[PDB]
Amino acid sequence: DLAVIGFELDTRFTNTNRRQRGHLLQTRALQFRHPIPMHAPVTLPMDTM
Amino acid sequence: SIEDQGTTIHGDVELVVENETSADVSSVLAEVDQIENNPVEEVLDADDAV
Numbered sequence A: 001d002l003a004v005i006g007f008e009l010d011t012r013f014t015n016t017n018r019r020q021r022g023h024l025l026q027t028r029a030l031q032f033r034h035p036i037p038m039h040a041p042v043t044l045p046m047d048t049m
Numbered sequence B: 001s002i003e004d005q006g007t008t009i010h011g012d013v014e015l016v017v018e019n020e021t022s023a024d025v026s027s028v029l030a031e032v033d034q035i036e037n038n039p040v041e042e043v044l045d046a047d048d049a050v
Helices: B030-037
Strands: none
Touching: none
16 A cells, blocks of 8 residues: 655745734833942941040 | 031020011922932833833
């Protein structure tokens, strides 16, 4: 029973009619936030008189 | 005057001699100016940024 039973083709449409749009590009932006903390003090005690 | 002085060690004393004393503080609070310029940090539109 040796015979060819089926096939597949590597066929493409030619998009003169732009039916297929393909991948999209869209511009976006991300924003990051870095607040600055206060840190513990250092003190130099000095005489009051 | 107390409005100009800053944390005086010996202190300051003033007498009110006014019949009335209005107080307009609309521009005093510093956060108001920050908001007026930028309610939120200014960010460029995504297309303008690239």
